[PDB]
Design a protein around this ligand. Structure first.
Ligand SMILES: NC(=[NH2+])NCCC[C@H](N)C(=O)O
Ligand SMILES: [Cl-]
Ligand SMILES: [Cl-]
Ligand SMILES: [Cl-]
Length: 236
Protein backbone atom coordinates (compact mmCIF):
# COMPACT_ATOMS: atom_id res chain seq x y z
CA UNK A 1 0.00 0.00 0.00
CA UNK A 2 1.27 3.60 -0.62
CA UNK A 3 2.08 5.61 2.57
CA UNK A 4 -0.49 8.19 1.34
CA UNK A 5 -3.59 7.06 -0.57
CA UNK A 6 -4.76 9.83 -3.01
CA UNK A 7 -8.57 9.83 -3.25
CA UNK A 8 -10.33 11.65 -6.04
CA UNK A 9 -13.84 13.05 -5.52
CA UNK A 10 -16.20 15.50 -7.24
CA UNK A 11 -17.30 17.99 -4.51
CA UNK A 12 -20.62 19.00 -6.07
CA UNK A 13 -22.81 16.14 -4.90
CA UNK A 14 -24.11 16.85 -1.40
CA UNK A 15 -24.70 15.00 0.92
CA UNK A 16 -22.00 12.67 -0.33
CA UNK A 17 -19.23 15.06 -1.33
CA UNK A 18 -19.22 18.85 -1.23
CA UNK A 19 -17.37 21.77 0.29
CA UNK A 20 -18.16 23.63 3.46
CA UNK A 21 -17.79 27.41 3.97
CA UNK A 22 -14.04 27.05 4.70
CA UNK A 23 -13.45 24.90 1.60
CA UNK A 24 -13.11 21.65 3.58
CA UNK A 25 -14.52 18.53 1.97
CA UNK A 26 -17.63 17.18 3.69
CA UNK A 27 -20.23 14.51 3.30
CA UNK A 28 -20.85 10.82 3.67
CA UNK A 29 -18.24 9.81 1.06
CA UNK A 30 -15.63 11.87 2.91
CA UNK A 31 -16.57 10.33 6.26
CA UNK A 32 -16.38 6.80 4.75
CA UNK A 33 -13.05 7.45 3.08
CA UNK A 34 -11.49 8.95 6.16
CA UNK A 35 -12.72 6.11 8.40
CA UNK A 36 -11.49 3.44 5.96
CA UNK A 37 -8.06 5.14 5.72
CA UNK A 38 -7.85 5.30 9.55
CA UNK A 39 -8.50 1.52 9.70
CA UNK A 40 -6.08 0.79 6.85
CA UNK A 41 -3.39 2.82 8.78
CA UNK A 42 -2.63 4.97 5.72
CA UNK A 43 -2.63 8.75 5.31
CA UNK A 44 -5.21 10.14 2.85
CA UNK A 45 -5.04 13.11 0.48
CA UNK A 46 -8.41 14.22 -0.95
CA UNK A 47 -8.23 15.51 -4.52
CA UNK A 48 -11.13 17.42 -6.08
CA UNK A 49 -11.89 16.80 -9.75
CA UNK A 50 -14.84 17.13 -12.13
CA UNK A 51 -16.62 13.80 -12.09
CA UNK A 52 -15.75 12.91 -15.70
CA UNK A 53 -12.05 13.32 -14.98
CA UNK A 54 -11.97 10.80 -12.09
CA UNK A 55 -11.63 7.51 -14.05
CA UNK A 56 -9.04 9.05 -16.47
CA UNK A 57 -7.10 10.38 -13.42
CA UNK A 58 -7.18 6.98 -11.72
CA UNK A 59 -5.95 5.21 -14.89
CA UNK A 60 -3.11 7.80 -15.22
CA UNK A 61 -2.08 7.22 -11.53
CA UNK A 62 -2.79 10.84 -10.59
CA UNK A 63 -5.08 9.43 -7.86
CA UNK A 64 -5.17 5.92 -6.32
CA UNK A 65 -8.87 5.68 -5.54
CA UNK A 66 -12.25 7.24 -6.38
CA UNK A 67 -14.82 7.90 -3.63
CA UNK A 68 -17.49 9.97 -5.37
CA UNK A 69 -20.79 8.04 -5.44
CA UNK A 70 -19.25 5.93 -8.18
CA UNK A 71 -21.81 3.41 -9.35
CA UNK A 72 -20.56 -0.15 -9.90
CA UNK A 73 -21.54 -0.84 -13.52
CA UNK A 74 -20.68 -3.56 -16.05
CA UNK A 75 -19.05 -0.91 -18.35
CA UNK A 76 -16.87 0.44 -15.55
CA UNK A 77 -15.83 -3.06 -14.33
CA UNK A 78 -14.27 -3.58 -17.79
CA UNK A 79 -11.85 -0.69 -17.10
CA UNK A 80 -11.43 -0.42 -13.31
CA UNK A 81 -12.09 -2.45 -10.17
CA UNK A 82 -14.32 -1.62 -7.22
CA UNK A 83 -14.42 -2.19 -3.51
CA UNK A 84 -17.48 -3.88 -2.01
CA UNK A 85 -20.65 -1.70 -2.04
CA UNK A 86 -20.58 1.53 0.01
CA UNK A 87 -24.25 2.44 -0.46
CA UNK A 88 -27.17 2.18 -2.93
CA UNK A 89 -27.79 4.67 -5.71
CA UNK A 90 -30.79 5.04 -8.07
CA UNK A 91 -31.38 7.85 -10.61
CA UNK A 92 -34.54 9.91 -10.62
CA UNK A 93 -35.74 13.10 -12.29
CA UNK A 94 -36.56 16.36 -10.58
CA UNK A 95 -38.61 19.20 -12.09
CA UNK A 96 -40.74 22.13 -10.89
CA UNK A 97 -43.44 21.25 -8.33
CA UNK A 98 -46.67 20.22 -10.04
CA UNK A 99 -44.79 19.21 -13.23
CA UNK A 100 -46.42 16.40 -15.25
CA UNK A 101 -42.89 15.14 -16.28
CA UNK A 102 -42.25 11.39 -16.05
CA UNK A 103 -39.05 9.54 -16.97
CA UNK A 104 -40.43 8.49 -20.39
CA UNK A 105 -39.68 9.60 -23.93
CA UNK A 106 -43.36 10.69 -24.47
CA UNK A 107 -43.37 12.91 -21.35
CA UNK A 108 -39.98 14.43 -22.14
CA UNK A 109 -40.94 15.63 -25.68
CA UNK A 110 -39.67 19.20 -26.08
CA UNK A 111 -38.13 19.29 -22.55
CA UNK A 112 -34.52 20.39 -21.71
CA UNK A 113 -32.98 17.80 -19.35
CA UNK A 114 -29.67 18.19 -17.54
CA UNK A 115 -27.25 15.34 -16.75
CA UNK A 116 -23.75 15.20 -15.24
CA UNK A 117 -20.94 14.54 -17.74
CA UNK A 118 -19.44 11.14 -17.14
CA UNK A 119 -22.43 9.83 -15.15
CA UNK A 120 -24.72 6.84 -15.47
CA UNK A 121 -27.55 9.44 -15.87
CA UNK A 122 -25.78 10.89 -18.94
CA UNK A 123 -25.21 7.43 -20.47
CA UNK A 124 -28.90 6.47 -20.00
CA UNK A 125 -30.28 9.85 -21.14
CA UNK A 126 -28.05 10.12 -24.18
CA UNK A 127 -28.91 6.63 -25.45
CA UNK A 128 -32.65 6.59 -24.68
CA UNK A 129 -33.63 10.27 -24.81
CA UNK A 130 -31.11 12.39 -26.72
CA UNK A 131 -31.08 10.07 -29.78
CA UNK A 132 -34.89 10.38 -29.83
CA UNK A 133 -34.89 14.18 -29.85
CA UNK A 134 -35.00 15.14 -26.16
CA UNK A 135 -32.66 18.06 -25.53
CA UNK A 136 -30.35 16.32 -23.04
CA UNK A 137 -27.64 18.79 -21.96
CA UNK A 138 -24.48 17.43 -20.23
CA UNK A 139 -22.81 19.47 -17.50
CA UNK A 140 -19.35 19.61 -15.92
CA UNK A 141 -20.79 19.46 -12.40
CA UNK A 142 -24.14 18.94 -10.68
CA UNK A 143 -24.19 22.41 -9.11
CA UNK A 144 -24.40 23.89 -12.63
CA UNK A 145 -27.41 21.63 -13.32
CA UNK A 146 -29.30 22.82 -10.23
CA UNK A 147 -28.47 26.45 -11.10
CA UNK A 148 -29.75 26.07 -14.69
CA UNK A 149 -32.86 24.33 -13.40
CA UNK A 150 -33.50 27.36 -11.06
CA UNK A 151 -32.77 29.80 -13.99
CA UNK A 152 -35.47 28.05 -16.10
CA UNK A 153 -32.93 26.89 -18.73
CA UNK A 154 -33.72 23.28 -17.83
CA UNK A 155 -37.12 21.69 -17.32
CA UNK A 156 -35.74 18.64 -15.53
CA UNK A 157 -32.56 17.02 -14.32
CA UNK A 158 -31.55 13.35 -13.85
CA UNK A 159 -29.15 12.43 -11.03
CA UNK A 160 -28.92 10.15 -8.01
CA UNK A 161 -32.15 10.23 -6.00
CA UNK A 162 -30.50 10.69 -2.57
CA UNK A 163 -28.23 13.50 -3.82
CA UNK A 164 -31.20 15.42 -5.32
CA UNK A 165 -33.33 15.02 -2.23
CA UNK A 166 -30.76 15.90 0.46
CA UNK A 167 -28.52 18.21 -1.64
CA UNK A 168 -31.19 20.14 -3.45
CA UNK A 169 -34.87 19.36 -2.67
CA UNK A 170 -34.33 19.78 1.10
CA UNK A 171 -32.09 22.90 0.50
CA UNK A 172 -33.35 26.52 -0.06
CA UNK A 173 -32.93 26.41 -3.86
CA UNK A 174 -34.96 23.20 -4.19
CA UNK A 175 -38.16 24.32 -2.35
CA UNK A 176 -39.86 24.98 -5.73
CA UNK A 177 -38.90 21.49 -7.06
CA UNK A 178 -39.87 17.86 -6.51
CA UNK A 179 -39.25 14.42 -7.93
CA UNK A 180 -40.84 13.98 -11.37
CA UNK A 181 -42.07 10.37 -11.49
CA UNK A 182 -40.33 7.36 -9.93
CA UNK A 183 -36.68 6.33 -10.02
CA UNK A 184 -35.52 4.83 -13.32
CA UNK A 185 -34.74 1.06 -13.15
CA UNK A 186 -32.13 -0.06 -15.75
CA UNK A 187 -29.53 -2.71 -14.72
CA UNK A 188 -27.21 -2.09 -17.70
CA UNK A 189 -26.86 1.64 -17.17
CA UNK A 190 -27.19 2.23 -13.45
CA UNK A 191 -25.28 -0.61 -11.87
CA UNK A 192 -25.58 -1.91 -8.35
CA UNK A 193 -24.62 0.53 -5.65
CA UNK A 194 -21.51 2.67 -5.40
CA UNK A 195 -17.98 1.56 -4.51
CA UNK A 196 -14.41 2.82 -4.24
CA UNK A 197 -13.01 2.88 -7.78
CA UNK A 198 -9.50 1.35 -8.04
CA UNK A 199 -7.07 0.27 -10.70
CA UNK A 200 -7.62 -3.43 -11.56
CA UNK A 201 -4.10 -4.38 -10.61
CA UNK A 202 -4.23 -2.75 -7.14
CA UNK A 203 -5.39 -5.93 -5.46
CA UNK A 204 -3.78 -5.16 -2.07
CA UNK A 205 -5.48 -1.74 -1.97
CA UNK A 206 -8.88 -3.24 -2.80
CA UNK A 207 -8.46 -5.87 -0.10
CA UNK A 208 -7.51 -3.14 2.43
CA UNK A 209 -10.54 -0.97 1.58
CA UNK A 210 -12.84 -4.05 1.67
CA UNK A 211 -11.47 -5.11 5.07
CA UNK A 212 -11.87 -1.56 6.54
CA UNK A 213 -15.44 -1.24 5.14
CA UNK A 214 -16.48 -4.59 6.63
CA UNK A 215 -14.98 -3.58 9.99
CA UNK A 216 -16.72 -0.22 10.13
CA UNK A 217 -20.06 -1.90 9.23
CA UNK A 218 -19.53 -4.64 11.90
CA UNK A 219 -18.95 -2.27 14.77
CA UNK A 220 -21.83 0.08 13.91
CA UNK A 221 -19.68 3.00 12.74
CA UNK A 222 -21.36 2.93 9.30
CA UNK A 223 -24.86 3.44 10.75
CA UNK A 224 -23.74 6.13 13.22
CA UNK A 225 -21.99 8.13 10.48
CA UNK A 226 -25.02 7.65 8.14
CA UNK A 227 -27.38 9.12 10.79
CA UNK A 228 -25.82 12.59 10.33
CA UNK A 229 -27.30 12.75 6.80
CA UNK A 230 -30.05 10.14 6.45
CA UNK A 231 -33.09 9.01 8.40
CA UNK A 232 -33.38 5.85 6.21
CA UNK A 233 -31.29 2.81 5.14
CA UNK A 234 -28.86 4.44 2.65
CA UNK A 235 -26.94 1.12 2.29
CA UNK A 236 -29.98 -0.59 0.75
N1 LIG B 1 -19.65 13.11 -6.79
C1 LIG B 1 -20.40 12.95 -7.91
N2 LIG B 1 -20.65 13.99 -8.67
N3 LIG B 1 -21.00 11.78 -8.17
C2 LIG B 1 -21.88 11.53 -9.33
C3 LIG B 1 -22.36 10.07 -9.33
C4 LIG B 1 -23.46 9.68 -10.31
C5 LIG B 1 -23.64 8.17 -10.56
N4 LIG B 1 -23.75 7.42 -9.30
C6 LIG B 1 -22.49 7.61 -11.34
O1 LIG B 1 -21.75 6.78 -10.78
O2 LIG B 1 -22.36 7.99 -12.52
CL1 LIG C 1 -11.91 17.60 5.35
CL1 LIG D 1 -1.66 6.75 9.63
CL1 LIG E 1 -23.19 -7.68 4.66
Amino acid sequence: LPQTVRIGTDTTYAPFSSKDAKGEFIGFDIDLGNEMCKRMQVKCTWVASDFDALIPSLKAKKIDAIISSLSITDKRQQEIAFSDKLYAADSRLIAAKGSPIQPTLESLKGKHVGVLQGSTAEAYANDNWRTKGVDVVAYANQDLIYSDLTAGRLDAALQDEVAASEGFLKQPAGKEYAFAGPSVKDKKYFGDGTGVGLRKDDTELKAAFDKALTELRQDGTYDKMAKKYFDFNVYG
